[PDB]
Write a protein that binds this ligand. Structure first.
Ligand SMILES: Nc1nc2c(ncn2[C@@H]2O[C@H](COP(=O)(O)OP(=O)(O)O)[C@@H](O)[C@H]2O)c(=O)[nH]1
Ligand SMILES: [K+]
Ligand SMILES: [Mg+2]
Length: 301
């Protein structure tokens, strides 16, 4: 089962899930073993606090049941790590708004624009009318690429001149979306690295200006982070969550990275739903996040 997800997670399975089988083989449950497991969880980018939680619960479960052979930890670890991901299993529901506004936040390079395009295509396949807002206003090649993309896919793209105020572009886009009976409006934003404080102030301005037209907008504040950046994904999530207030996360580029275990750190540290995971190049490879599928693929033996 889950052949495609298992292949996308092949390098992560070296360190987690089925990867624990070799660590436990023929070993006894003692402090040495838990020290080896802690190290391996840390190597897998599970994170300091999340690893401590797992080890604590696992040790108590092992002692209370008086488990002796390390192989018996496998099922317990599967349960512990599965409960971490279950807490952020909640698919995005865009139904019933006019438009449903998604504010896409994140740094450049992580897959933010790619994810916008895949989401837009998926929503249109579901029968929705989609509009995009080109809010990354100082990156002229990026804006024109999004426009060319919209023209190729017959999806309207709201944009202004290079250097325009992002909040003004997004205001015009919400106005146009309402006038055109748009179901989903997806707003891109800047993701530049220099002067982080300026970017965060820009996002708060965008939200305030949105609410001049619809006090419920943005209905979703979605962060995109890149699993191949390891703990940088965690630091980015903390930055954007404290700055604007996230309501969903997309985790991209799980395929071909050994750092996929960072998903447990993101889930445990923030408790924000993971709406989608990117596990390949297809439109359909931006898949809704399902915790039990992910755990089954990871721990399959
Ligand atoms: N392997 C892989 N590459 C991805 C995925 N999602 C996005 N990318 C690539 O990440 C790169 C950066 O994407 P972009 O959307 O341009 O990044 P932004 O700066 O955050 O907008 C592009 O080459 C995308 O194709 C994914 O799930 N898997
Ligand atoms: K305005
Ligand atoms: Mg972009």
């Amino acid at each position: 089962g889950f052949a495609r997800l298992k292949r996308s997670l092949l390098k992560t399975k070296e360190n987690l899930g089925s990867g624990f089988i070799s660590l436990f083989r023929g070993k006894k449950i003692d402090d040495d073993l838990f020290e080896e497991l802690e190290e391996q969880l840390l190597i897998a980018d599970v994170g300091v606090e999340t690893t401590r939680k797992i080890i604590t619960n696992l040790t108590e479960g092992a002692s209370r049941k008086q488990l002796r052979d390390a192989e018996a930890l496998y099922g317990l670890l599967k349960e512990e790590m599965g409960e971490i991901l279950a807490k952020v299993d909640e698919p995005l529901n865009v139904e019933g708004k006019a438009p449903f506004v998604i504010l896409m936040v994140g740094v450049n390079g992580v897959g933010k624009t790619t994810t916008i395009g895949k989401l837009a295509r998926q929503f249109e396949q579901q029968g929705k009318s989609v509009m995009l807002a080109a809010g990354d206003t100082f990156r002229a090649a990026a804006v024109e690429q999004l426009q060319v993309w919209g023209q190729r896919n017959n999806i309207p793209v709201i944009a202004q001149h290079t250097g325009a105020d992002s909040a003004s572009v997004i205001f015009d886009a919400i106005q146009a979306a309402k006038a055109r009976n748009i179901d989903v409006l997806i707003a891109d934003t800047a993701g530049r690295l220099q002067n982080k404080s300026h970017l965060m102030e820009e996002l708060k301005k965008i939200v305030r200006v949105m609410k001049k037209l619809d006090v419920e907008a943005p209905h979703e504040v979605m962060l995109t982070i890149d699993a191949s950046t390891g703990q940088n994904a965690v630091s980015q999530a903390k930055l954007f969550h404290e700055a604007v207030g996230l309501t969903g996360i997309t985790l991209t580029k799980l395929d071909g990275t050994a750092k996929g275990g960072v998903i447990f750190s993101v889930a445990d540290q923030f408790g924000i739903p993971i709406r989608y995971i990117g596990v390949g190049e297809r439109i359909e490879d931006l898949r809704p996040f399902k915790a039990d599928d992910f755990i089954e693929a990871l721990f399959a033996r």
